[PDB]
């Protein structure tokens, strides 16, 4: 579930998970996607209840888990095409699919105790194109290799240094940007926008990425990841 | 106008409009374009004369045939064999900051900034300068330039390289005077190559498509309208 | 010659010609390919003996050198192939094909004294389009302007700052890296290392490009150049 409320002209919308730190869910999708899509206000905020920002995927118990997939592409869809540009309040850590949502927000304001991560090769998973390009693009290409290959961990710090960050502050001064924001021409803001989205982050995975990404996520090592957790115990990856 | 000095293996060519903070007209940019052509120099500096590098367009002369005259100045600075160091002494604005970006390396005044008003104005760009001003101060600080207007200092500037160092005019001139020590074949393959990089991109169906929108709207007359009324404007995005 | 040991899961590669700076040559690169290809082990550290980690290419008395070429070719093809994430613990400078195969590593870890160079507007020479694709990704595009057209060199807290460098540190903190990376699920390392390779910094040269970099190659300049370091003045460039 949501939080949705409107102040003159910006449009703030909470991810209201606090439990699961807002990992994302088919019904999470489904509710953000619905409220970005409206659509008076001139600017929405996006930022999560509690400690994270959004923690990642967490479909256990979402009994529609197989819509997943298609609900995420939905929102992000909706994203890109919104009008509005989408100050992401990020309160918390946004690991995964909440790295992703937040990488999709057009402008960011990070918690000082926030960070941002992709913990694939801690779990055996791949990433899509799009998520590795505009990662490249926030925080660098060397940046993204440690991040991509290592599972490293960029700070609020780091992300105010590399651009990730626009701002280091909280939920307020999102809301004070976006109203300064609510009031400058929105053709101006929806032309660089749109530009700035089509830089090329937005590809199509190459044969050879797709082969990888099945074998990933398709792979025994995949379950090893949760065995090892469930078990307190190190992974022992086979590369299979 | 424009002031043209060589010294030693170095040309320097000065905007002198400091009257208009060095904005773009007509003939400043023809001016440009000929000294630019022209450059005995292995070197060229670019500067402006005064608080500013350059603010804007002015356009208040010859003025339809000015858009050709922007393209055709950045088309020979571009083709230009000559690495061209932009001394940028004070703020650099709209088609200023375009006029900077152009430049191949920059020595920035420590109370010089870069900006892209086009949101407080209703305007928008063409591709090349979100591409470029991605690639000078990174994908995150251009959304929010071009989002949201914001200013880039200098120390912003040397951090994410639109700065290669902060500097006056005279450390532009020095910086130039090694360049022009070095091998001129390799400074031209490395420009071309690096010009090369993608930011020189046609316009989407979609991006002309708002861009002409932007250009066309009522948001554009109605900020100007505010500059006279003397009050706050009230886009309606259209 | 190289040296080439193996700890936990990680072999170190260390290139030993020190007499001439790590300096590449025929025999220096295609027995650096062997041990990459051949690389039981789950990373690579790539490193340097002596006061360089490689200072340019070398090919005083190297009976094969008209082979050089295709061998370099062949190194960076097996280094972009390998499955295994590749470590350059930069002990010193990377200068020329000492940074061509710095960037190709896929973390780079610094020591403070290191630097990184491309020198080819000294010399009269022309790079790939790779090298200075990789390279603007790696710095900046700004500071890569700089570096192409006035020789500039990267130093190492400049270098962690855009992040050519991951770390700053020695070869013995590259390889305690490497060991966590090792105990990485293998599958997700090789399809991000993929994808981020095909960033499109593997680009070929445009006619333009050829053309420019075959004049440069083929001039008088660069006889100079050479002619001018034997010499120990400063040269006379013609543009010729």
Redesign the interface.
């Known amino acids: 579930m949501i939080g949705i409320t409107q102040a003159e002209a910006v449009l703030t919308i909470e991810l209201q998970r606090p439990e699961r730190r807002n990992a994302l869910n088919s019904q999470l999708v489904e509710e953000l996607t619905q409220a970005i899509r409206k659509a008076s206000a ?1 600017a929405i905020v996006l930022t999560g209840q509690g400690t994270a920002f959004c923690a990642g995927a967490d479909l256990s118990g979402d009994a529609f888990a197989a819509d997943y997939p298609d609900r995420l592409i939905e929102l992000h869809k909706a994203m890109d095409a919104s ?1 509005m ?1 989408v100050v992401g309040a990020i309160n918390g850590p946004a690991i995964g699919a909440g790295l992703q949502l937040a990488m999709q927000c ?3 304001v990070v918690a000082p105790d926030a960070f941002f991560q992709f913990p ?8 899509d ?1 799009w998520s ?3 990662l ?11 991040m ?5 961990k960029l700070t609020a710090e780091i992300a105010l ?6 701002r280091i502050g909280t939920l307020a001064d999102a809301q004070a ?1 976006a109203a ?2 609510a ?14 989205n ?3 982050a937005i590809e199509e995975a ?1 044969p ?2 797709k082969e ?2 099945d ?2 996520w398709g ?1 025994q ?1 995949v379950i090893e ?1 949760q065995v090892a957790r469930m078990e307190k115990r ?2 022992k ?1 086979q ?2």
């Open positions: 001139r009008p540009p057009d402008l960011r694939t090769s801690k779990y055996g998973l791949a990433l194109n590795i390009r505009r490249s693009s926030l925080v660098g290409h060397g940046r993204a290799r440690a991509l290959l290592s599972a490293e240094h590399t651009g990730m960050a626009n940007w300064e924001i009031r400058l021409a929105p053709l101006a803001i929806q032309h660089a926008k749109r530009v700035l089509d830089d090329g190459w050879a990425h990888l990404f074998k990933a792979s090592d990841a190190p992974p990856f590369g299979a």
